[PDB]
Write an enzyme that holds these catalytic residues in place. Sequence first.
Site, mmCIF file in Angstrom:
data_model
loop_
_atom_site.group_PDB
_atom_site.id
_atom_site.type_symbol
_atom_site.label_atom_id
_atom_site.label_comp_id
_atom_site.label_asym_id
_atom_site.label_seq_id
_atom_site.Cartn_x
_atom_site.Cartn_y
_atom_site.Cartn_z
ATOM 1 N N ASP A 37 0.718 -1.310 0.000
ATOM 2 C CA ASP A 37 0.000 0.000 0.000
ATOM 3 C C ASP A 37 0.712 1.299 0.000
ATOM 4 O O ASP A 37 1.397 1.634 1.026
ATOM 5 C CB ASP A 37 -0.908 -0.231 1.263
ATOM 6 C CG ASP A 37 -1.923 0.858 1.532
ATOM 7 O OD1 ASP A 37 -2.218 1.568 0.595
ATOM 8 O OD2 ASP A 37 -2.402 0.984 2.715
ATOM 9 N N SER A 89 -0.232 3.888 3.039
ATOM 10 C CA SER A 89 0.050 3.701 4.458
ATOM 11 C C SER A 89 1.592 3.440 4.547
ATOM 12 O O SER A 89 2.213 3.281 3.484
ATOM 13 C CB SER A 89 -0.797 2.678 5.053
ATOM 14 O OG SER A 89 -0.591 1.336 4.791
ATOM 15 N N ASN A 98 2.859 1.523 7.735
ATOM 16 C CA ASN A 98 3.162 0.449 8.675
ATOM 17 C C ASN A 98 3.078 -0.934 7.969
ATOM 18 O O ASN A 98 2.370 -1.215 6.999
ATOM 19 C CB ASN A 98 2.219 0.400 9.861
ATOM 20 C CG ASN A 98 2.233 1.701 10.654
ATOM 21 O OD1 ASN A 98 1.595 2.722 10.325
ATOM 22 N ND2 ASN A 98 3.045 1.683 11.724
ATOM 23 N N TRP A 102 2.211 -4.920 9.217
ATOM 24 C CA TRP A 102 1.626 -5.649 10.265
ATOM 25 C C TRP A 102 1.006 -6.990 9.770
ATOM 26 O O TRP A 102 0.657 -6.871 8.597
ATOM 27 C CB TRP A 102 0.682 -4.844 11.172
ATOM 28 C CG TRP A 102 -0.528 -4.390 10.415
ATOM 29 C CD1 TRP A 102 -0.711 -3.154 9.823
ATOM 30 C CD2 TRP A 102 -1.706 -5.144 10.179
ATOM 31 N NE1 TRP A 102 -1.968 -3.154 9.221
ATOM 32 C CE2 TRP A 102 -2.582 -4.317 9.429
ATOM 33 C CE3 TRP A 102 -2.099 -6.436 10.557
ATOM 34 C CZ2 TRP A 102 -3.833 -4.776 9.038
ATOM 35 C CZ3 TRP A 102 -3.344 -6.874 10.153
ATOM 36 C CH2 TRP A 102 -4.190 -6.042 9.395
ATOM 37 N N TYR A 130 -7.837 2.832 9.685
ATOM 38 C CA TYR A 130 -7.847 3.061 8.222
ATOM 39 C C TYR A 130 -9.308 3.441 7.856
ATOM 40 O O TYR A 130 -10.245 3.417 8.685
ATOM 41 C CB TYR A 130 -7.327 1.850 7.517
ATOM 42 C CG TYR A 130 -5.983 1.210 7.819
ATOM 43 C CD1 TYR A 130 -4.916 1.544 6.999
ATOM 44 C CD2 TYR A 130 -5.821 0.281 8.854
ATOM 45 C CE1 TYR A 130 -3.655 0.980 7.212
ATOM 46 C CE2 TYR A 130 -4.557 -0.287 9.070
ATOM 47 C CZ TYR A 130 -3.505 0.064 8.253
ATOM 48 O OH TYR A 130 -2.289 -0.510 8.461
ATOM 49 N N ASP A 135 -2.493 5.836 -4.798
ATOM 50 C CA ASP A 135 -2.669 4.725 -3.897
ATOM 51 C C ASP A 135 -2.931 3.326 -4.417
ATOM 52 O O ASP A 135 -4.043 3.020 -4.844
ATOM 53 C CB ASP A 135 -3.773 5.134 -2.914
ATOM 54 C CG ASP A 135 -3.933 4.238 -1.727
ATOM 55 O OD1 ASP A 135 -4.872 4.606 -1.015
ATOM 56 O OD2 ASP A 135 -3.324 3.206 -1.332
ATOM 57 N N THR A 177 -6.072 1.252 -2.907
ATOM 58 C CA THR A 177 -7.472 1.640 -3.271
ATOM 59 C C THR A 177 -7.772 1.132 -4.692
ATOM 60 O O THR A 177 -6.981 1.459 -5.541
ATOM 61 C CB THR A 177 -7.540 3.214 -3.223
ATOM 62 O OG1 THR A 177 -7.531 3.415 -1.770
ATOM 63 C CG2 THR A 177 -8.778 3.914 -3.816
#
Length: 326
Positions: free
Chosen positions: A32, A35, A37, A39, A75, A215, A218
């Site tokens: 992405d 963003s 991070n 995880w 988010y 993005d 998306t």
Amino acid sequence: IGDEPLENYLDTEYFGTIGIGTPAQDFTVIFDTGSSNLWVPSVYCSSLACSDHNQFNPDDSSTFEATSQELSITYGTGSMTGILGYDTVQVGGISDTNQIFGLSETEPGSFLYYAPFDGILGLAYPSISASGATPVFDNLWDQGLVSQDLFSVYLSSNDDSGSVVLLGGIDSSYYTGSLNWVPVSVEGYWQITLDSITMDGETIACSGGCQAIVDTGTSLLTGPTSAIANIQSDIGASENSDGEMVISCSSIDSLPDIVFTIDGVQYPLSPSAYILQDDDSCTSGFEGMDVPTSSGELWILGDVFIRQYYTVFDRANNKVGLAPVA
């Protein structure tokens, strides 16, 4: 140069495989640019989405190091809670050592439950990183794990295999002509300045210019609801009884292109890209989403846009490179 091939799931989500730990524990994560991070689900998560996705077990890793730092991220699709940990992450054949990532504890919602992927791997600036956690690409750069401070994305069409994320390189064969460079306008997201949107010599939206972000996370093209409606109108989309924004497949052969002016260069989007066709049902690739920021109401240049333009994200330069796909 790291090469991460990506799965094209119904032209809607693109995810690749990564390994975490020693020996590696395998996970699928969405790549992405929206963003920052990294995880994955963990053994500490009792949520339903965690019960149908691979869970990282830190007890199984010889290179895992715990921390007491908590993580909380929200988010546009939901939230997640967890803890930070350090481990070795294999990405695109690169061994990213001492990479901080989150171990989820909670992942509420049916959205993750349903998702074909397990976690997310953010590619935006550290400035939008929850807990200040160093993003994967920054860590590669900080350890000299890549040669150039850039990454490039090729997203395929028609559910074909072939989408790729190239860490520290560009593949000159995935595009045509020259790469056009756009200054990042605000460093957080890959935010650029959209000059205008046009249909036949006329400015159908974003007049005097606006702000958009590139993005990969998306699927559609989003804008503020008010402007999206005008476009919806201009292409023949109408709200059906079940919510959908249906359109007549015949329009594809008949509609003009919607042209995005970026830094003065024209970027056409053909009806073939902006209308989605699935078994006799053609719908709009445009969506209404007010994403109010400080510097405005954001426009999201999603997969619909990306699949038509090879994209290079350059952190050396703080620029976006776009070229029509080969």
